[PDB]
A paper describes a structure:
In this way, SAHase is a key regulator of SAM-dependent methylation reactions and of Hcy levels, which, when elevated, are a risk factor for neurodegenerative diseases, neural tube defects and cardiovascular diseases. A typical SAHase protomer is usually divided into three closely connected domains: an N-terminal substrate-binding domain, a cofactor-binding domain and a small C-terminal dimerization domain. The substrate-binding and cofactor-binding domains are separated by a bipartite hinge, allowing them to oscillate between two conformational states, closed and open, during the catalytic cycle.
The structure of BeSAHase in the crystal obtained by cocrystallization with cordycepin of a protein sample that had not been treated with ammonium sulfate (see §2.2.1) is a tetramer with three sub­units (A, B and C) complexed with Ado molecules and one subunit (D) with Cord bound in the active site. There are three sodium cations near the active site of subunits A, B and C. 1490 water molecules plus three PEG molecules and one acetate ion from the crystallization buffer were located in the solvent region. The Ado molecules in structure (i) were sequestered by the protein during overexpression in E. coli cells. Since the protein:cordycepin molar ratio was 1:8 and the original Ado ligand was apparently replaced in only 25% of the cases, this may suggest that the affinity of BeSAHase for cordycepin is over an order of magnitude lower than that for adenosine, leading to the conclusion that cordycepin would not be a good candidate as an inhibitor of SAHase. The most interesting situation is found in subunit D of the Ado/Cord complex, where cordycepin is bound. When cordycepin is bound in the active site, the protein molecule assumes a semi-open conformation that is intermediate between the canonical open and closed states. The backbone conformation of subunit D is sufficiently different (see §3.3) as to place the side chain of Glu197 in a different direction, so that the hydrogen bond between the O2′ atom of cordycepin and Glu197 O∊2 cannot be formed (the distance between these atoms is 4.1 Å). Also, the hydrogen bonds created with the participation of the O5′ atom are not observed in chain D of the Ado/Cord complex , because the γ torsion angle (defined by the O5′—C5′—C4′—C3′ atoms of the ribose moiety) of the cordycepin ligand is twisted by ∼100° with respect to that of the Ado molecules.
Author numbering:
A (entry chain C): 3 to 473
B (entry chain A), C (entry chain B), D (entry chain D): 6 to 473
The structure:
Amino acid sequence: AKPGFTDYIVKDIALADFGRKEISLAETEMPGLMATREEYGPKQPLKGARIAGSLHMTIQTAVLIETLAALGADIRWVSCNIYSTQDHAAAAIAAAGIPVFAVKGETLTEYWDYTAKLFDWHGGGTPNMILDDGGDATMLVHAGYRAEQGDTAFLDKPGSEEEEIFYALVKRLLKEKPKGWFAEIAKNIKGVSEETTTGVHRLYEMANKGTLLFPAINVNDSVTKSKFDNLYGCRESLVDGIRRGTDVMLSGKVAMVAGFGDVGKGSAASLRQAGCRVMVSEVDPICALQAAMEGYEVVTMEDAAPRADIFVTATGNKDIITIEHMRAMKDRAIVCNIGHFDNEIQIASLRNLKWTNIKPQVDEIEFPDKHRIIMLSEGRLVNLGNAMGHPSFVMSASFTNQTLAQIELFANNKDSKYAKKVYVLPKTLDEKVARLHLAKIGVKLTELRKDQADYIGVKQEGPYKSDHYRY
Amino acid sequence: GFTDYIVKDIALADFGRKEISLAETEMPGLMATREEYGPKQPLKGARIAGSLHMTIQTAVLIETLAALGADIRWVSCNIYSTQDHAAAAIAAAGIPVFAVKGETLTEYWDYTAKLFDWHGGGTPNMILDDGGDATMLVHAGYRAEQGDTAFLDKPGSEEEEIFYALVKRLLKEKPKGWFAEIAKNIKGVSEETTTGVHRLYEMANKGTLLFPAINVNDSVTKSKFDNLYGCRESLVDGIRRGTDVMLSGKVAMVAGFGDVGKGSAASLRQAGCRVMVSEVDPICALQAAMEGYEVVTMEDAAPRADIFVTATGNKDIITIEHMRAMKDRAIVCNIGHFDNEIQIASLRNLKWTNIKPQVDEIEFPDKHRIIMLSEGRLVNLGNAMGHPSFVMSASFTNQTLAQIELFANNKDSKYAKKVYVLPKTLDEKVARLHLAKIGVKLTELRKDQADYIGVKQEGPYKSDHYRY
Amino acid sequence: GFTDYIVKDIALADFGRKEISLAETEMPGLMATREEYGPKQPLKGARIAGSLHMTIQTAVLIETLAALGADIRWVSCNIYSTQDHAAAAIAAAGIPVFAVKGETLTEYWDYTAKLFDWHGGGTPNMILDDGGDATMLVHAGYRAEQGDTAFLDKPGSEEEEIFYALVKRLLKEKPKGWFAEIAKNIKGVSEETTTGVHRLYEMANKGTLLFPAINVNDSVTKSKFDNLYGCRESLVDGIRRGTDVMLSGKVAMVAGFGDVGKGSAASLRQAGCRVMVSEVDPICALQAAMEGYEVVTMEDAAPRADIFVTATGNKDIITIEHMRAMKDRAIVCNIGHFDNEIQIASLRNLKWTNIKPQVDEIEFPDKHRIIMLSEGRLVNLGNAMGHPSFVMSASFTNQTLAQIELFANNKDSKYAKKVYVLPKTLDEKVARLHLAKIGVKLTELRKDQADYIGVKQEGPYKSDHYRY
Amino acid sequence: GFTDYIVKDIALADFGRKEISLAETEMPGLMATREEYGPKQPLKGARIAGSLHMTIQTAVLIETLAALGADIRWVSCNIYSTQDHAAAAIAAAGIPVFAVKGETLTEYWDYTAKLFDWHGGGTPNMILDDGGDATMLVHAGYRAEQGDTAFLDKPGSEEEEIFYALVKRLLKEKPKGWFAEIAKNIKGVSEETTTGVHRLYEMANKGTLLFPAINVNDSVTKSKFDNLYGCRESLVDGIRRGTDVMLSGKVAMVAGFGDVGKGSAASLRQAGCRVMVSEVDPICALQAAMEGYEVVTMEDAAPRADIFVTATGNKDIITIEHMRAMKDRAIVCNIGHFDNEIQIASLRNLKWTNIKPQVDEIEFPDKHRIIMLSEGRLVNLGNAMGHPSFVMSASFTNQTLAQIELFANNKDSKYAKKVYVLPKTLDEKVARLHLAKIGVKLTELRKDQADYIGVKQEGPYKSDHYRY
Ligand SMILES: NC(=O)c1ccc[n+]([C@@H]2O[C@H](COP(=O)([O-])OP(=O)(O)OC[C@H]3O[C@@H](n4cnc5c(N)ncnc54)[C@H](O)[C@@H]3O)[C@@H](O)[C@H]2O)c1
Ligand SMILES: NC(=O)c1ccc[n+]([C@@H]2O[C@H](COP(=O)([O-])OP(=O)(O)OC[C@H]3O[C@@H](n4cnc5c(N)ncnc54)[C@H](O)[C@@H]3O)[C@@H](O)[C@H]2O)c1
Ligand SMILES: NC(=O)c1ccc[n+]([C@@H]2O[C@H](COP(=O)([O-])OP(=O)(O)OC[C@H]3O[C@@H](n4cnc5c(N)ncnc54)[C@H](O)[C@@H]3O)[C@@H](O)[C@H]2O)c1
Ligand SMILES: Nc1ncnc2c1ncn2[C@@H]1O[C@H](CO)[C@@H](O)[C@H]1O
Ligand SMILES: Nc1ncnc2c1ncn2[C@@H]1O[C@H](CO)[C@@H](O)[C@H]1O
Ligand code: NA
Ligand code: NA
Ligand code: NA
């Protein structure tokens, strides 16, 4: 009746003006995305692309969405986490006429219903590109394909609440959609670009077994993503989530970080810089040695559980903090997860205990002996759930990579240089991403003279480092 | 059946109570003070008028004062610092409080006057003050009441206009001699902050101070923890919540390198900023340089920093000429006092656009914009939640001990109409109360070791001139 | 013909002069003091006996006093802290100096007595002291000369025995009344360090202080710079030169968190160690915890830490029982005072093996070993070069102004036989003299801004109770 | 009766042996390798010719190889880095070593040749090379001996003239076919430097590499310690020992933000400097900016900085134009490539004044001066002691494992005449061996956790593309 366009689901469409104000502020902080718009504008490399996006529906993501649209893309979007949407960013995208299905605090049932909506393209048909963060859109396609080719038995063996919902979803879509719908989608998708370490792992798995249905670009392992987003982004946004959720004094507290890869390194720095004394656990002896060389005590979770005030899982692995650990923690210890999903902490094992909600994404859990723990975002990503995720400037680097990966797969694969395997962007594009961000922060880069470039075996314009260089 | 309050939304009270419970665990000094003094009820008969940021941390202080026997009325000391769920919890507990986040300046001063209309009639007999506004209202009313009225016709500020209007109104609507009645009944004031304490010493020096005062700011366990470590935690929190900018890669400028300036510069450098500092005091300037900060003037910094913070307690630090020279979408804020460290009033003929509560974008004729936080009032309290509970436990344990001193320990008039600080034995006790919660194990001196350095095993361990 | 000196190798004098010239550029406070006061000759007629670490930095101080007109005799105040090339340069410039790195305790006390036999006859009329040893010789000799001699037969350490033997030999050899003659002629003493100042305040309280004293340690520009930032730079320098250990990944324990312990902990933490702290003072312990250090007892640290540093000014901090529990090749050192923070004397019958100067390996019957630096005496001066020149410029400018105060500005006897500190105007001036060299640009208050915070534009900017 | 060595002074052996013992405790990777492989004697029958900086740390590596069964002859790979007491201790243990600190280029090359006159006759069968000089000698002599001699005449530099004359001399004084005899007997070379590995790949791509090679430069544990952590430990050490300047308050410029530059900037910032950086690589520049460093050109830095450090591996980084613009007594040094980062030769007509070994003052016609460390050579090895033992234990454990791989694990010819890297499980093993000494407790994965992230419980834990 009142709006002509309603092919979207947002919490409050009246937040759109506020969203637009914050998007305009983020654009100033995202020079790489804005420069990418100017450069690729005239040529419309994404004209004819139908991008299904599954990525935290934040203000930063809204700038990415509008960059893809400025390059010619038709778009449908969902968040990849039930607590990470910023409702004013989702309202601004809906108000711009782009189908988005994203609400902060949506349920798991809604989450998966919304993901399925990516694939009913407005006007008929399917997407032809996927932009993924964590692999959930990619997984819907592959599980439904597997089931539709006749291997349905896995849909009846659910191991968790979200598995049950997911398996229910695939069953319902095989019941309601035209026969062969998943192979139709599969044949139409020209590529997937994937943002995060866990999603990328799921892809290399499928690619090794030969089950990956379309080419993929691993955006996580761009240098200007993994060594910036994963590291500096968490260094800024982990303590932001903990402060907004709890308002605790960090000076004087002991924090335990599980994992010392890129996210754990950034998370331990976030906490140490804020005043905590940080301990770390690791299974990888190189990463453990790095933590020790940075001055962190390296201990087991059993050693840390009776002692630390704050626990952060940063592993991408499962069953890091168990009910046994939480039974041993001090009263009102804080527990949260910056890694993945909701199984780094054994949330499901806590569900027979008394939970008291304090405020959105903050709960107090009471044990039989009366000691309590404070749980943030029910064990899901604390920086996006309890605060606002990474700040715009570092997401500009991640999302310039995403945009260039979408151009590669959609526009620069006319010769099948990308087969049904996982690829990374070339170093010349990685360097270009960094170069686009230097002016905003006042870096003055030195130029090699020809004799200096020759001396070290590089061209003046780069690339400056071998493909094996680790930075 | 209780109605004697003004808060934004009383339905927030349950949320407030839950966060107050969480804060109690983080406030061992206040909680131990309830246990030690609760049996003796040292504040029985006290009528405490409090003017202090109506936060969750202040709620724990109010309820400690009440556990010690005090009758209480409360207001916030800043128009943006109230936490509305804290205020609602205090109202729901039957305690008169008049505190709304984003209240107007007229509401602010009218609420302050409501402190002195005690429920049941009469006046308070204690003041607990942060920034001296409640104290100033009594003294200015007293002065006018005595017949020195001309200063009321000479406001140099809009808020001065509101404040003199209020005094004029109370002179007409309250009985003859009401300010002298309040002055004679106030047994003492304890004041929390550097600016308020300076105004106290200056009244005491001129002979105009009407009742005894304890300078709580200069407790070691206040000035060297709250002003330093508090701002180190809460400054960047206010900036992040207001703006969500990446601090790594940004240049920030901090005016002042006293206690708050030291904590502020640390807040920003620890968050990844490259930090520059201004100072007028060569000792503080040399401290900043030895800590690795570049020390520059505001004129030097104005065209190039991304973030500006005033931390001086002084006026006219960031001017319209500075702001005209700033880069587009520079962030400006104040963590010191009042709203005149930045020349906010000089901006009010420019285009302001509200982004969200306590965040505005100000556009200049040449189209460059600046981002102003909390309309240039305290950014940590206005844009976030102020200092965290643990460090406020130390400040507020000092406040509670100061209230006990003035109301219960002045039977021999040891406190005259002068400004006093608490003794080092109490300062050391406040520290000691916080050690167990954070796992500190203290060493005990043996007697011959205590003798060798000339202290008693139980302290005090330092001379009164020691600077820590 | 001039040989009224004792140095290790007079051939080091050219090298010493080269490093003195380099240090002058790094010491703008002292050089500016020469420039201002040289032509006024305020120390003309002064005969200054100095007992202070005979380093390159002290040589710039000695030549500053000489440039102000002083006649001088000098000794080091520590047996391991002399830099032999600095001593050789001072001897080459014709100033009596008695200082060798590695001199014995016997020589150390014989050299101190040489201060008082002034060349050309007579005694000194000023003392510049670091640690109080020259001052103590005078007071012990005077006490014994006034009849009270029994204490001389009751030493409780080998160094006391050497000291008491010296006093006895002086009373035997020198003209009757010699100590009273010295005491009558000394117009003042200025004292550099925490321990020395504590001894002076004690004597003042007991009425035994023989002449006026200035406590130079408690200038802000000494205690909050030298004690803090000097140790932050020179502690880890001493440990690295002594041991060359990698510090990243090691656990270190610092006893004390006053000014020297704060700087020491920072030195180790900035170098990559995980640092623990002990304290007896709850305020300093809370500071350590708020700065992120674990606060533990020495008993908890002893089996765990790789590196131990005493920073207390107190005795018996690291005992034989602690060292028995330490892991093999743990490193032990002292940055505080004398050699009794660590129980070195209880180690004397274990097997010691010298590694190199000021580095020894001590082995226990169970075969674990510890690495001892400078035999438990000041590690930053014994194993490396002491504090760098720039921070010593602030300390030594203070010392120079104190000699001026006592020698040239006591015509009205404003300084009685008590302990005084320099005024804040001089403290501020010291800092101001150091700003240009490190590129600090100070802001100047406008008149209305000064009036607003209640200061003069020229300072002082802070109250006398300000703690910085 | 042992005489097969050339060192400065065999009497230094006892001091060297004391320091080797102390380093062993700090090199748990090498000592644990002795424990694990000692019983198996994997290097029995190995004749290892080593060319690696002859320091105390390298002595521990030499005795580790011997502990595994190896016969050994050794030389330094650099004329300046030899520690004469380390060389003496090795000669005194009966191991042929030819290494004197400060030897001529001619001696450097003749000593390298002596690696190949094996005691008892015959040749080495293993090379442990650091920079590729020993490998280059074999390959050039082989090339000449096959009849391609034209290159031996027509050299460029003086070092090339020395090298070519050495090849000519060996072709006369050694049997016909000597170089081909050596080539056929070498079972492998391990090499850890960039330039050495570049030479090996270049020869492998051209088919001219004569035997298998392991590139230890590729190792994660070698690369992070030898480049990042080692320089973070030893840069400021070299600067302090050379100059004793206060770092707090100073501005430093680091050219390069690769691994050595990252470690150097951190070294200086942690010690108190405010650090600026230059870079040509936008990714490395952005890293530096995100870590809070100002990124500028050398032209911008030249008039401003107090200290300059070159860390690029490139040439002509600091030029005469830059040094003309520097402030008086700025400090200049190099931690990057062995020479040519600073234009030293352009200073040769200025007045140079030696201050002490490896410290010189250079005076410009306008009388401003700069302080040059180690004549532009490596400041950490030249002015101090290089990387600490624990750092070198990581790189040297890698070398030991590579020697084991080539000598003992090539029965199936899995290594042909190409360049290989150690597999990630041996890189992980290097780290594993260092964990117990520094108190790390590693978590073990359960099988379902290992499965979930796609790894075996025993590793490797990361893909070969992982950057750490
Ligand atoms: N927001 C908070 O939570 C919080 C906490 C404590 C105190 N405060 C307030 O912060 C302000 C500062 O308090 P403080 O304890 O740090 O005081 P302080 O005296 O220790 O420090 C103020 C510093 O400002 C410097 N200064 C004065 N005018 C200057 C100018 N024009 N330019 C540069 N520097 C100048 C002074 O030299 C001084 O060192 C006060 O108003 C105080 O009440 C706020
Ligand atoms: N080596 C140097 O270059 C250098 C520089 C300045 C001062 N000093 C000397 O360092 C010593 C300390 O000086 P300071 O200025 O830091 O004094 P301080 O009073 O500021 O601090 C000493 C601290 O030691 C603590 N303490 C006392 N006994 C203790 C114990 N048994 N265990 C743990 N802590 C204990 C005190 O509580 C105190 O906080 C003095 O001897 C001083 O003369 C040395
Ligand atoms: N002193 C030591 O003990 C020690 C230890 C390890 C390595 N090194 C040597 O240090 C050098 C650097 O090693 P690295 O591992 O850091 O190499 P790297 O390749 O990781 O870093 C070199 C950096 O220099 C930058 N660069 C090149 N030319 C430049 C210029 N004109 N201006 C500014 N930046 C420039 C490059 O972009 C690169 O990021 C090599 O010569 C290496 O062998 C010395
Ligand atoms: N503000 C944000 N907006 C969008 N994505 C974000 C934000 N913060 C972190 N992320 C992304 O979330 C991923 C984790 O699911 C990370 O790979 C990171 O790139
Ligand atoms: N390089 C130095 N030269 C002279 N005195 C020093 C040096 N380093 C530290 N000191 C002084 O030694 C005192 C301790 O005896 C400290 O108070 C300090 O001022
Ligand atoms: Na954000
Ligand atoms: Na708070
Ligand atoms: Na020195």
